[PDB]
């Protein structure tokens, strides 16, 4: 009844719960509105958790090496964004890490407050040689702002000062679409065939379902009393 | 010039209740039941029926209307008074009774009885069903009451899972179990294995197993009283059955004794996520498998 | 609090309750997801009382004169659309009209079942000369069928037979905008507007502000359980 | 449907001469056959063999659902008004309070044992404002709270305080009130005297009992759990409320050998000690159990 | 052997009334009261509790369960007789005009009623207030009202008024209101008037028909029963009205003499078929339309 | 907060010193110090101006809440509470059984109702279980009621004197009721019996009239309008009546053969004596229809 039919459901391993979903009856394509809305809404006022910070102690600076790296802070901070993770902590935490000896970084291999988990470990993270590799500590936050890095922890050098503006809404790929079905007699009937994906942290069942609320409340937390 | 003699006057105007209820204020048995007459002077609605102990007369509908509205009007003026005085009330009822806080949780005791008026915690007598309601609904919210048979979460906190109770017990100089070494049940049973507050979840689950096979609690009193149930141990026909849990005592002083039982007891905090954003009671949850237990 | 401020509210020729309305703080463009949302949806659909049929029978037919007219059916059925009106009747009714004698038609001058009214009378309606002018009877309906002129009251002949998908659409010009704002302390929050107008039947409160709850429900009857 | 026609014609329905109803049920050929002749129509189905011989046509084997089930209710009653006590054979629920649940009346347990040994018992909570609520109704099947409340029930409540021990407090394995052996109530705040429950009448009385000896009741932080009363005093020190009668029992176990004492109790005004209060209705005390025992328990209450 | 006294026993297991619920019957001074104890022996679970007058003992929960189920079980066997006994159901509720219940319409109506829909008959009258409610209500199934418009379809019902007349005036002895036969708008009464329901719409109506040109008012006595009505026939001291289709039956009624004023009500309502919905019930619709509509 | 200290300063707060408290509140002279000082700290704001002369520091401006809302409650009782104003000055009534419009109505409807015409009191044939009920839940207010079965209706309130009269019946020579014999056991009760409304003071009283006046009680329908009478009370379907004093006005119909019937049931006797039923004590007394007409009900309702 104006209604979802959960439809093809294939989270695969996770990242992109390929999830073609359907809401069959949209008299007129107005379904699109929710579609194009949630199109941004589904990844609008979300609360994705992610990085900001980094504690490459020893290399206060942010371009020098830190040897044994086959890949320097430029590529070390490069390999943050890609990390992937989650907490409720709602407040910052840290992981550190002192592997040494010649080593990839089992993305997994990590340092782990509250939930802070390799939502999927095993990311290549960091080459190294037998030489002592060095610690890597850093914030963790929930947020929805991936536009401004300036005046970051540049507000108060907790340590290293170096802080990147993380990007964080799990779903990076998504594909909303509509189709005028039959039942046009009473009124041109249409249906919304749409994908999302997501990083494999939060499937649409906890993302599309959210947003859904998220505005339903917030898009209309009132009948525009006006 | 009256609201006190009015407090009981209510009962007087209510279920007739004059002297009965008058004494119930802090005065003579028949003192307010006399003020009614004082108010009958001026009042046109007060009633002192001498042939209708219960049957009303309408003093209520006319000259009570205020009487309640005043009542809560003085009350809530005196209530507001002080209520707006740095009245920091950070109170979150959680669960810590019977086993475990019988013995080894004196830690959370240290942070809820040694601490000052703060993180107020109302853990009273409650089990795992009486807790499943009160506690699982989280008035008390999470616990250390044997898992309400369903739980688990980790975050705002230090995580953790569960802990457990071995197969042994406390008694007395010779309190039945202290008399019959047979850990197989039917040893302290004669002290009718009194149902420390019956059937809790840590109380039952081990009591459930204790007497689920021929063995029987066949208890006498079924009440929630560490003192009393363990106090009447002084009189000595009743005992506790929490297995090798609340025995820090027979473990301490062996006019309370330990010769085992055998029989199952485990405890996973109700970890109410209400205190997986918050630590009075996430502390209670993280504390536990980390602080309450040790 | 994410909130309407009823803002400038007009009081004259109700048609277009010129009603520039605001919501002030919407974190970012999540409120822009509203303007359109409305946009459409507002002018998606208020189901709408509208005259649809016509009983003339001065001519059964629909191009012949009916004299004394200075204006025939093609301008009489035309002067229908423009009529303006409303019922709860939720079911058809009629008005007839037998002025005669040389006469405009005080749009007002009419024939008036249950709740049916010249939401604003005085529309010019119909010239005429001294000759007997003739009856004009017709349905009335409130629905979303403001489209498709064919079949309908056709499979069921009824004499003086014409009918047409009317407008059933009171709320015309409408618009809005938006802007970044101060309060950047709490994020560069930001603002929208809108106008709507309307025919002067069903002010935005019962149209724009009504559409507000039209979807809030229906946008997602379920919590996107998908 | 009534008994005699019910039970009579039905167990008839498997035998007659109505001589079968007269037996088992009791209704004789007189009031059975005559009334059943017209009753054969009232539920609307022929029960026995209309003056024929042997039958089960449409008797009560299929009528007892809407019939017997009822008089099976009073069949349980037909048995008897119970075996022990007429209503609720087990009806002996004790008050839950922090004063005297444990140790002041072991010869009352003796007499209860003498009149009825090792007899299963139960418990409730009252409050003392809530004790009042549920005693003027008489919920708390045996009830004790400051007599200054709970007044209604049957027989005009019969306010009855067996005795009013005078309050002291918990001194300890280290108390310096276990040095300072008395207990006025300043000597409380001297160490961390946490007061009990604001709202609970129990403390309304204690408010006196700590509030008129260089102290005002300081309900700062009470965990509302005896276990905790000991889970920071098993460290050795912490101190709050244990009244007189069990303040025979404040000095107890090998962490703690404690300074006893009497009441300082400047708080009195008129009569003011906390009172063990058995209060009742005849219906409630209309049987050997509570009435005589409840009296004896309110009687054989020694310092032991 | 008790299927009757048990009805009064349910009142003692609800509000604990063994003398207050038996006061409507009358027996000794409490009867049931001294009978509760008699049954206390005949009942394993009988709270006694003349003591708990306003409270309880649990005789209810155990040995009532039947007591109600029996109750409706004997009752609905008593319902049985008639349930199958050619129990034709013409019984109904006819919302008719205050004076449409005598020999004005009832004759013609009982006749057409002989023609198919003869209800198990009545006397009935509303006041054009609550009557429209009953026309929606469904318990009445056809009504009268004087102001609120509405109607629907036809046959058994649609737009129809019930008579029309400057609202008219029952008048009798102790009444010079016969002369108040008909002044302009309202010179009849002109003194403390009021009407039907200190509240109704014939009431507001005539109060405002006297006031519909200000024969003026005070609220002290309106039209209630036929006697309260005749009080307005009686008074001349405080007064009301009674219409034209309401005259044929009233003016033939024992003392009354009926008297409008050029005072004025119509009657308009949803006196349509909306409660008839039956060609039989439509047969009134014949006789609600062949009788009063002008 | 006491009304005294309350407004004593609450308004002195605009005077700005002492003495005026007496001119504002009860005080005769300036006894407000022991109050202002007790109120200065007790609500928790600066009352007056310690050596700060005239200046409105708001002790009462924001104190009136409760405080003077409360004593405004008894503020309407300080002007009148026993004379005139009385938790509603005027307020008597009568929820009749509707007999008395024979000739009594006008005299009761005058003498007072023509002197203080404000109370909206009726002469209306109250329901019966709905009489008892409204005699409790509420209706007109008081009772001129004939108790002839509803005996012991709680009562214990206060009478007035109400009415006393048969319920005498319409029969007719224009009914074959000419042969009907003086409205009796056989000719006041026989026909497709019809009564007033089921659920009716005059039709538990006219269903009584079928019971107390032993009429079959077919109740083929229910008639209080008396219009069913003459309908088939000369034409022949029912038997029912207006009460005897109501017959004084009912007999005014034609071809209705007078027959004194409802204090007349069985031997044209054993019917309605309007046994005075009355319960309302002092209630809201002391004012016009309650000190004049409440008593007047006694002699006025039945004045002839």
From Swiss-Prot, chains A, C:
GO terms for biological process: DNA-templated transcription. One of its GO terms (cellular component) is cytoplasm. Belongs to the RNA polymerase alpha chain family. This is DNA-directed RNA polymerase subunit alpha. The N-terminal domain is essential for RNAP assembly and basal transcription, whereas the C-terminal domain is involved in interaction with transcriptional regulators and with upstream promoter elements. The keyword Transcription applies. One of its GO terms (molecular function) is DNA binding. It catalyses: RNA(n) + a ribonucleoside 5'-triphosphate = RNA(n+1) + diphosphate. Keywords: DNA-directed RNA polymerase, Nucleotidyltransferase, Transcription, Transferase. DNA-dependent RNA polymerase catalyzes the transcription of DNA into RNA using the four ribonucleoside triphosphates as substrates. Residues 1-226 are annotated as: Alpha N-terminal domain (alpha-NTD). The keyword Transferase applies. Homodimer. In cyanobacteria the RNAP catalytic core is composed of 2 alpha, 1 beta, 1 beta', 1 gamma and 1 omega subunit. When a sigma factor is associated with the core the holoenzyme is formed, which can initiate transcription. Its EC number is 2.7.7.6. It comes from the Bacteria. It is an enzyme of class 2 (transferase).
């Amino acid at each position: 009844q104006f209604q979802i039919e959960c439809v093809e459901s294939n989270t695969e391993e996770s990242r992109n719960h390929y999830s073609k979903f359907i809401l069959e009856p949209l008299e007129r394509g107005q379904g699109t509105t929710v579609g194009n809305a949630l199109r941004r809404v589904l990844l609008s006022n979300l609360e994705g958790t992610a990085v900001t910070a980094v504690r490459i102690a020893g290399v206060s600076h942010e371009f020098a090496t830190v040897p044994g790296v086959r890949e320097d802070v430029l590529e070390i901070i490069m390999r943050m964004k890609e990390v992937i993770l989650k907490s409720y902590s709602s407040q910052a935490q840290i992981g550190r890490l002192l592997v040494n000896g010649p080593t990839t970084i089992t993305a997994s291999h990590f340092d782990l407050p509250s939930e802070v988990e390799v939502i999927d470990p095993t990311q290549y993270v960091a080459t190294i040689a037998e030489g002592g590799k060095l610690e890597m500590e850093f914030r963790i936050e929930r947020g929805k702002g991936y536009r401004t890095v300036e005046r970051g922890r540049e507000e108060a050098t907790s340590l290293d000062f170096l802080q990147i503006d993380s990007i964080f809404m799990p779903v990076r790929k998504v594909n909303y679409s509509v189709e005028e079905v039959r039942a046009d007699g009473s009124i041109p009937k249409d249906r919304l065939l749409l994908e999302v994906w997501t990083n494999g942290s939060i499937s649409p069942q906890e993302a599309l379902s959210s947003a859904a609320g998220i505005l339903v409340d917030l898009f209309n937390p009132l009948k525009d009393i006006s | 010039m009256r609201l006190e003699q009015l407090q009981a006057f209510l009962a007087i105007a209510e279920t007739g209740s004059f002297q009965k209820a008058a004494s119930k204020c802090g005065v003579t048995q028949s003192t307010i039941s006399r003020q009614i007459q004082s108010l009958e002077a001026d009042l046109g609605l007060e009633l002192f029926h001498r042939t209708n102990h219960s049957k009303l007369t309408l003093g209520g509908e006319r000259l009570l209307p205020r009487a309640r509205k005043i009542c809560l009007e003085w009350e809530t003026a005196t209530q507001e008074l002080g209520d707006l005085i740095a009245g920091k009330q950070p109170e979150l009822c959680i669960a810590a009774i019977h086993s475990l806080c019988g013995s080894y949780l004196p830690p959370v005791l240290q942070k809820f009885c040694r601490d000052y008026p703060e993180v107020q915690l109302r853990v009273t007598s409650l089990g795992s069903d009486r807790a499943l309601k009160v506690l699982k609904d989280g008035l008390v919210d999470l616990a250390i009451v044997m898992n309400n048979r369903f739980l688990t979460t980790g975050r705002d906190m230090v995580v953790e899972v569960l802990y457990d109770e071995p197969i042994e017990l406390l008694t007395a100089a010779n309190h039945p179990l202290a008399a019959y070494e047979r850990v197989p049940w039917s040893e302290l049973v004669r002290y009718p294995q009194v149902v420390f507050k019956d059937g809790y979840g840590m109380q039952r689950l081990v009591q459930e197993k204790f007497e689920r096979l021929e063995a029987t609690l066949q208890a006498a009193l079924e009440v929630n009283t560490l003192d009393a149930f363990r106090g009447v141990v002084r009189q000595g026909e009743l005992i506790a059955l929490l297995p090798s849990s609340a025995l820090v005592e027979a473990r301490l002083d062996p006019t309370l004794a330990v010769r085992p039982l055998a029989l199952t007891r485990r405890v996973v905090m109700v970890t109410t996520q209400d205190r997986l954003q918050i630590p009075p009671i996430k502390h209670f949850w993280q504390l536990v498998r980390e602080n309450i237990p040790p």
